[PDB]
Amino acid sequence: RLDLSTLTDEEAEHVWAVVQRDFDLRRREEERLQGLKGKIQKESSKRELLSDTAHLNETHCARCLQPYRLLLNSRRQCLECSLFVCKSCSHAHPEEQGWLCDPCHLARVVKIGSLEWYYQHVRARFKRFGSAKVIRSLCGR
Amino acid sequence: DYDYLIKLLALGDSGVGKTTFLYRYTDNKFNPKFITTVGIDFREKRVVYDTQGASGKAFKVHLQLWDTAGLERFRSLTTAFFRDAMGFLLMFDLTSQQSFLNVRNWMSQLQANAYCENPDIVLIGNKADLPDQREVNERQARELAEKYGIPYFETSAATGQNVEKSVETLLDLIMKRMEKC
Ligand SMILES: Nc1nc2c(ncn2[C@@H]2O[C@H](COP(=O)(O)OP(=O)(O)OP(=O)(O)O)[C@@H](O)[C@H]2O)c(=O)[nH]1
Ligand SMILES: [Mg+2]
Ligand SMILES: [Zn+2]
Ligand SMILES: [Zn+2]
Numbered sequence A: 001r002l003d004l005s006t007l008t009d010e011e012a013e014h015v016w017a018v019v020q021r022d023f024d025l026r027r028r029e030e031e032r033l034q035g036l037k038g039k040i041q042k043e044s045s046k047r048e049l050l051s052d053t054a055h056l057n058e059t060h061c062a063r064c065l066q067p068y069r070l071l072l073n074s075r076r077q078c079l080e081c082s083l084f085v086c087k088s089c090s091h092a093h094p095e096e097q098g099w100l101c102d103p104c105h106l107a108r109v110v111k112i113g114s115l116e117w118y119y120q121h122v123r124a125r126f127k128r129f130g131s132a133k134v135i136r137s138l139c140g141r
Numbered sequence B: 001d002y003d004y005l006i007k008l009l010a011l012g013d014s015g016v017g018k019t020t021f022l023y024r025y026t027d028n029k030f031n032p033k034f035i036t037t038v039g040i041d042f043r044e045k046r047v048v049y050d051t052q053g054a055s056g057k058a059f060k061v062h063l064q065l066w067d068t069a070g071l072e073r074f075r076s077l078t079t080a081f082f083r084d085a086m087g088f089l090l091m092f093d094l095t096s097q098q099s100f101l102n103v104r105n106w107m108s109q110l111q112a113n114a115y116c117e118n119p120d121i122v123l124i125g126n127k128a129d130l131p132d133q134r135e136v137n138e139r140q141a142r143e144l145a146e147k148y149g150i151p152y153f154e155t156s157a158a159t160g161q162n163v164e165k166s167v168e169t170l171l172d173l174i175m176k177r178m179e180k181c
Helices: A009-050 A102-114 A116-123 A130-137 B018-027 B075-084 B097-113 B138-147 B163-178
Strands: B004-011 B040-050 B058-068 B087-093 B120-126 B152-154
Touching: A009 A102, A009 A130, A009 B004, A009 B040, A102 B004, A130 B075, B004 B018, B004 B075, B004 B097, B004 B163, B018 B040, B018 B058, B018 B087, B018 B163, B040 B075, B040 B163, B058 B075, B075 B097, B087 B097, B087 B163, B097 B120, B097 B138, B120 B138, B120 B163, B138 B152, B152 B163
Parallel strands: B004 B058, B004 B087, B087 B120, B120 B152
Antiparallel strands: B040 B058
16 A cells, blocks of 8 residues: 655645645535536526427527527527527637527536546556545655 | 635656645745655646636636656656645656656556546646746657657746746647547
């Protein structure tokens, strides 16, 4: 097992600190992703409700529901779910002449942002991540 | 507040200039003091990454720059954090054929403690600002970097020479990996 006895204490005290900061970080990143996943469900269910309100997207933004004629920008189609939304609720996506609706945009930051590919290869080669391993080893004090 | 959290880590011999290289990247400054890094440490920096297509879109990225210790007294601990990074800055000193010969040990060290056998990596030759004290044949370093199919960059934490460029190359290397999901 990773054997930290060699570490003198001024050192030990330092390492842990660095490790704490790492945990603070991890915590934060999981809540960041939670929040976004939260926004995608809320917006997504709203769609499922207004879904029975015939042709509403034709006159109202799919995201903020404000009326088109009242805005200072100009209606746009999401290249993804092909609904319309105002400039304020739209975003120009990475690779393609066009735009994305604020929900579809988060939907994508989340799929790429989570990094499943990475965290799973990590989890399948070791049982825990660095700070974790180093935390139990630093418990030998 | 940001779109992506990317984790990077620099490893190499002691004194090849990793802490200094990183500080120059996040502070565009240059501290000359040598205070061998105790085990591990990391600095954070928010940056923007723009995409290419055909234009594309800007993205806020929050970098976690991992700085490992070079000494052996710590080899054990340091290698534990290698799995915590998406990409590596594998650097050696241009003024020490030694550190350059250890680059082969480091690579394998990485291959065994990283999340994968072949992670995104970039070879870095530091301390270009002192050509009078240089001792590493540019061709070898350039050829080794081709054996691994890895980008090479002679850099300088002092002059800042490529410090910015190299890092944004590893980053762009990891961004192509993620996007394929
Ligand atoms: N002229 C010049 N000096 C540099 C450069 N980079 C680092 N140095 C110097 O080389 C020394 C070592 O830099 P460090 O960051 O401590 O190297 P290190 O490998 O991270 O130290 P360890 O954590 O023990 O591995 C410092 O005292 C700096 O003054 C550079 O690009 N140019
Ligand atoms: Mg250092
Ligand atoms: Zn709107
Ligand atoms: Zn959409």
